[PDB]
């Protein structure tokens, strides 16, 4: 599993690959670990599939109900407590999952919660088998001052590096892109395809 | 053990051997690991028996329920998701088996359920013992253009396969084939036999 | 690590792909498992690195001795039973190998050895955490009556089947072919690439 | 694994199966089971591969020096006592296998020998994860004044079932037959599968 | 421990030993394993014996309870299930018990249920420390178009087999007979040595 | 197993079951546990068959060379002494047997040694998992002024007794009398049979 | 510890010894393990002091007010049915005794009782660490044809076997016997060594 | 620990890093992982010092004694197959070391070795608890067509992201070049100070 | 992590490092460990990161209570004891954490609370894995008389030799400083750096 | 125990304190842990008293033996060597010491040796218990350019340090100060005590 997310001036960049690796061989090519949880919230996914995938519906129903009672959209840090809460409440007998959490409220955000927690906020970051491969990336590469276009290049060819060197990690990449303006978009595969093939790495 | 399922256009095929491994020796070479719980809905089981057909038991009763309720079928994810939820409850004291769903909603739809409560759809899943043999037979072989007719073929030779390798696994295939227009509908036994001898698998 | 090795009328043919993973992650892409030890004898690895090659060396020394003094190819059955004994005499400190010997002395010959020093001959083999799937492809589609290409295009599938399940076999598939009339032959890699993309493997 | 040696009159027959389990799966389907160490002698082996294998190259070099330096076969007793000795010296580092010797010197005898070196003579036995079953049918319908035909289909249908119940047992049934007018003589192939449909077994 | 259930034609048969092992040695001779449980019904039991008597009871007044509400018997596959779902509620503390139900409802039916709430339903099924050699006497010599006195000398036959290789069975040899004619009917004792007797068995 | 041994005012009678049990099961219904090791010596064994027998083996070879060197037959007290040093220098990889010992060199003599190498001379003895059954029909009935036929009855009772309340003794008794007179004799299987039914155990 | 229960035509005849064991040592050499529960209805106990001390006080306690209500003495398998039931609710945290129960309702009992709550009907049984050696007299001994005079005479000769070889068993005999005519008679002291001498067992 | 190998057209590359983890904390900065162990040869040490320190001691000592009787620098592959032979010979009492070894013969090559000897030929590899971030550096970044100062550049960046995510890395950066014109040469500290200003890393 | 705190005359003075090391590597630069809690009091943070974060809302919500209910802000005593009963509540179930809590109500204070719920008053004291650096420092250059400017570069001094020595501890320093006449004030960044560079930190 | 070594422009001082914890207590407070091992050397011990204690006879005997065959002083850099291959000759069975070992050959040195033979070398170092706080110390006071009085004065504060925060340390202060012009001269108990008074450090 290789998840990643970075902040921008006005935009965050979150993306995963899709391979599920049930019973110790590849059982599928094709799972889901980014996820829309709000209008301008997204949220990533890494460990135990059925842990996560029960964070993924409960943060879903939180946070609209959040939204129907007080009539706006929860702020990002607030998203990124009530999950440090819930996680911390059962930490031992705990959800045995790495998360991520970016989304726009007055400005781009990017959180960290690991299993027993803790939530520490980060210009990006990266979870899964395939992180520390990520991270040399980003370290190398990563600017402040990028475009969306080429913070989109950034993370594929991060997570590109990291397919290659991580057995766990393989499969299609999912890029979702959030604004304000535009709100939570997912890129569409096609133009992730041609993003592929203009950067050389198939 | 050995469970398949595929997908056609408007399709969904699934079949099991019967060989039951109870006390460490072939104790019975008939047992039932295909079953109907819905109009257009099937599952295979993989695992403890009594806790695979406790299983059995519940979905049958939650969804005809849930049909007199809201008067319509259960959608498979639906389904999917409310054993998803059920397994993952006790998953400190799980029940220790391996599940497939598939059947058609709007549209052909198979899903793997870990004990964990992990829900993944796919084109085509395999669970038990006998698995691996299945992937290599449907990597191989499997073509989403495939008619009814070779679909049944193809999941017979898998199985077949399986059987030759897997001593685990034995007995006579039980395959059911599942569409909108004609609902759930189990493959005579003969229809069965006449299809392996023409495949030159006796 | 994924091996492979067949037997037809007058020929033996083998094959192995080349991903190594040590320290829990992909370091090495193009390693080496398949070995020639003799004029018409080969021999594929899979297990430790340190062990298998040591193995290799150990061969190819008795090998080519055995040649000079007694001035004929050692047997293929005799090959076999050598490294039989030299695994069984250390079985509880033992070589934490997989071995498959194959060759031409008067009729084709392919043997598995196992780390305690047991050796089966049989038409086809494969070792590796890839081999289920190998054996699914094999058990449907394997044929005795079988030319040397239909066989190079066969495990040549059966492998790429294994790549696309198990996590620990990846990169460049290595094919020899053995016969009497031109010995030991590997397959140029521009070929082997011309068979995958005939076949629609890429 | 089974094995299964009876008495006669002048008449000593043995049967094995064929199928190795080597990883958890059925590697070999048609493995050998069943050797000839002596003019008059043969042997079954059950449980580790490599100990077994190592074990009849010792007991054919053994029995054959004999011969040539005493002008005489060693008598039956006589070469279970030698591997009762060799067994039990390594009693703490043993051989992991279930051995039956049979043989004409005098009169028909059969021998069962443990991994620890115990030697009980018997007028029938049984070795390997079968042998339960092949118990209870010797029980029923052994009888000592059998002819030699009616003997042979006895073993056949001790074996087939075994092969019903045992899912580590399977593959074709080899049958030697050793007299003193004829020698060691193993049937041939298509004459067991002439008294197997005979016998209704397939 | 040994007992066995068959079915024929119109007729369920059940047979067990006597033997009770308390404390490491034979303590108990005429030890109870089968009992009636409905008007054509009847359950054989093995394991611990406390744990066994219990649910003998239990069952005797469920059975009961059901028969003076519903004024009808419950039916072979229902007292099945009960039966399963109690073991199955407790299966982490569980009842250390193999089970065999067996009757006439509207057809013969018999039915293996183990500690942890498996129910599958068998032509014949046996249970205990000497069921695997029951199985072998069945399977070669068992026939579904059997006679009831043809039946009744199968199970003594194949219990005394068991006697004299299992240490654990031993003792007279109980019979019952469930009919629709003629209800549950429990063979008498002096019948059981006359058939013994003319068997050969003693 | 049972063993026994007694001594009278000019007689050692010896007796043992025949049972062995070997994987669990009874594999072997007439096994041998009483050897004759001198003109006037026997010995009885219990445990492991292989360790068992090896001393026995060794016993022979010493005491003859003994005989044949010093020109008269070794006495009991020695001979218990040199099976104790055998025991005792191999202490912590020991032979885990439990012996008797008895016969004539100038009185009658009954040793138990242990397998730490503990030797202690008795009246009477018992070994096996049958001997407390046995040491209560002694303790109750044992004369030191009974004959050599009232003896031979007594061990027969003794060993009766102990079949019918353990599992792992069975088979029929074996029975030898040793006397200066008429040296070491085994009775006749006939004649322990017309004491078994004159004595009412059968 | 030594109890001994034995049934003859019209009377039940119960008794013990008095060592009792605490911290390793013979700390008490007249304890009692023998009372009377019911009008005619006598219990002995083995193991845990504390834990049987219980026993006795609850059944004294449920079998008088069974009396008083039902106007009519506990029936002796209903008795055995009750503490089966008392034991088995408990047998993860047992009471770690063993237990006999005799007595008349309309004919002569004795139950044997284990820790897990199995009961079992016989017509003579024996408890503790001496039950063994009491097994032995009791097999070549017993008769059913016994008087009442000759059974106590043989209750007493078998625990004084047992006090001879088993060193956790000693002290004074103690001897009930229960019939309709007399009810619950404890036998006096003094007419207990007088049979002791007569018998010659000091 | 860092540690950096690659090869270019006519040059070979290595670098670490100089922090030492002694005791649980950072008790030297200025540690030597880089050895020149032959005229065209390097070798780079990680894992445990004391096992490290010696193997580059014996290194010296064989490639010296080597170049002295064959007149000749030892190839590459030559010098791993040593390595390889010597860490496998102890591999059940390893060295604890990760060892990579570049060089010059006729062409570069860069070879890993792990600690039970195993030996991979590679374009470039990385060791220590630093090198997945500098594998996701070179994925991305590392091409054939580099010049020796851009390979300079690159192996400086990598292990500069290394070191700003693992926390057993640190200290300055020791960088030698190999090429047949001019040898070994480490590169002095100044010049490696002005690429890290000039890359902006500092 | 690295915490210090210390008292002056009139003012308390608390820094931290920033490094989080999560996964076992350096996920987050700039975590946050120094915090508010009251209007005169500050608290650090050292050990899990969940806990950690739980507790600082904790204080935060019960102080803020405790000011409104009360009127006045809680003596820093208190605090510190309000904590120790919170943490000594779960002693078996304890939160992974090691407290610092400093400010004014009369003069200043700083306590020092371990995980089990101990509270000591001390002048300064610090926690982490880089404390006993910290010590060192202040052992040999801490005086009661220092100004504030002097306490702080005594803070920073402190710090920076714990970031040399201790791989868990890094990042940029955050300084507190808390008096009666000013309240909490954190000093600003660049602040912090013009004292780094004029010590000669960097 | 806290040991310590610095390096100057033309000296080495190395110190330690003297207390000796033998059996969980302080038993001796002036033990003695630095030693002079050559004309130009000297050493200091920690960890285990009987090993330590050998290691320095061993030294002394090495270095003296050098000195006369060769006539010129071991080199620092050889001694380390020396003591490196020792340690890790035996590493699994090692000496639980830690070493520092310095001298003037041409150069000062000081090299930190490690249970396993590990050797580095570096211009200042402490081992024992008290170690970080020492570390700290130096980190903040180290200064190349010290004087000798500077450098003593500074090793005294470090230690003195030590002693308030680790209860393993403790006692009198041993200096020693290495020239090559005045050779290795102990600093006499008085003049350390006047420097400690001088400095305030009592």
Redesign the interface.
């Known amino acids: 599993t290789t998840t990643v997310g970075i902040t921008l001036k006005d935009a965050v960049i979150m993306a995963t690959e899709r391979?599920?690796?049930?019973?110790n061989?590849?059982?599928?090519?094709?799972?889901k670990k980014l996820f829309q949880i709000d209008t301008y919230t997204g949220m990533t996914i890494a460990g135990?599939?059925?842990?996560?995938?029960?964070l993924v519906?409960y943060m879903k129903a939180e946070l609209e109900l959040y939204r129907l009672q007080r009539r706006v959209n929860m702020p990002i840090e607030a998203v990124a407590?009530l999950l440090?809460?819930m996680?911390?409440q059962v930490?031992?007998?705990p959800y045995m999952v790495?998360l991520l959490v970016g989304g726009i409220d007055t400005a781009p955000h990017v959180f960290?919660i690991?299993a027993?927690?803790?939530?520490?906020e980060?210009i990006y970051?990266s979870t899964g088998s395939g992180?520390?491969?990520?991270?040399?990336?980003l370290?190398?590469?990563y600017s402040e001052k990028m475009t969306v276009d080429e913070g989109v290049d950034l993370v594929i060819?991060?997570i590109?590096?990291?397919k290659?060197?991580?057995?766990?990690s393989?499969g299609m990449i999912d890029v979702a892109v959030i604004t304000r303006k535009d709100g939570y978009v997912q890129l569409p595969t096609d133009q992730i395809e041609s993003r592929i093939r203009k950067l050389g790495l198939i």
């Not at 391979?19 to 019973?23: C, D, G, I, P």
């Not at 599939?49 to 029960?54: L, S, T």
């Not at 992180?131 to 990336?137: K, L, M, Q």
Request: charged share 20%.
């Open positions: 391979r599920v690796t049930m019973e061989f590849i059982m599928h090519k094709n799972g135990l599939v059925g842990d996560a995938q029960v519906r407590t440090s809460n996680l911390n930490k031992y007998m790495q960290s690991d027993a927690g803790g939530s520490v980060d970051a992180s520390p491969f990520v991270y040399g990336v370290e190398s590469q060819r991060a590109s590096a990291a290659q060197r991580d057995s766990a393989g």
